[PDB]
Ligand binder design. Structure first.
Ligand SMILES: O=c1ccn([C@H]2C[C@H](O)[C@@H](COP(=O)(O)NP(=O)(O)OP(=O)(O)O)O2)c(=O)[nH]1
Ligand SMILES: [Mg+2]
Lengths: 144, 139
């Protein structure tokens, strides 16, 4: 911005960018570029991923058990599961951010391949190319 | 503004002809069971790849950034099926995630666990995801 800027409205931060803000706030490693992790970092990410996936499973189970007894679930009844699913997003993004890997760039490539694959007969369309996550990591290593 | 990863899942489901509801919608049992299996397989792939990398480190290998591509791929696949579950429930993942994120920033003054996990300071208050769901259902 400069003296010519009369309005400066940014696009909302992405969920991946939010993880960077969180790790900066708590003093956790959050490298700009792909960075081989110490084993202690890998162990933590594993622990948080296990913790979060167990909580998601417990809420899905609770919903199935209630549903079975003639409780027909309501929308508000989805709130704990939604919270746990968001926590699982949070620690999945969190692992990518601590690896210095732009999760949006990797996701975009996975989405490109998946969305392209949906144009096939699920079978692949002609000329389909799978997600090249290795290429994304390489290009992230050379970014501005 | 470019689309979000949650909005990408909405586009994906519309593209495979399995268009998903716009507002929170209680699911049939088989949908919960399907989404759970997808989460379990994706989580197991991530779990296995982290164990794989740790064993290489225990052998003395110095990992490179390129060595991280399979893990990054599996983590992104886990994002895909996690966002996918929220989308099939009709729940805006970004609205829920913003509420969870705000309640995680408020932990910054808390202590850390020995393994590095951020713990909660005195008086911390949880995210109110019930309120986000009510916001999404109405209006
Ligand atoms: O180091 C951390 C700690 C927490 N988090 C995030 C992940 C998730 O969104 C949320 C989980 O925090 P807790 O493990 O403390 N679970 P919860 O808040 O549900 O505690 P409890 O079940 O005991 O009420 O905080 C991180 O990302 N990194
Ligand atoms: Mg909990």
């Amino acid at each position: 911005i400069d003296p010519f800027t009369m309005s400066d409205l940014p696009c909302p931060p992405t969920n991946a960018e939010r993880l960077h803000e969180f790790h900066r706030a708590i003093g956790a490693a959050t490298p700009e570029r792909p960075t081989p992790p110490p084993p202690e970092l890998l162990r933590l990410r594993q622990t948080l991923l296990d913790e979060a996936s167990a909580e998601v499973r417990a809420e899905i189970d609770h919903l199935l058990a209630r549903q079975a007894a003639g409780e027909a679930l309501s929308a508000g009844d989805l709130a704990p599961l939604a919270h746990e699913l968001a926590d699982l997003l949070y620690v999945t993004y969190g692992a990518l951010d601590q690896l210095g890997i732009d999760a949006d760039a990797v996701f975009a490539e996975v989405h490109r391949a998946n969305l392209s694959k949906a144009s096939g007969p699920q079978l692949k369309p002609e000329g389909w190319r799978p997600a090249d996550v290795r290429g994304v990591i390489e290009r992230l290593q050379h970014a501005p």
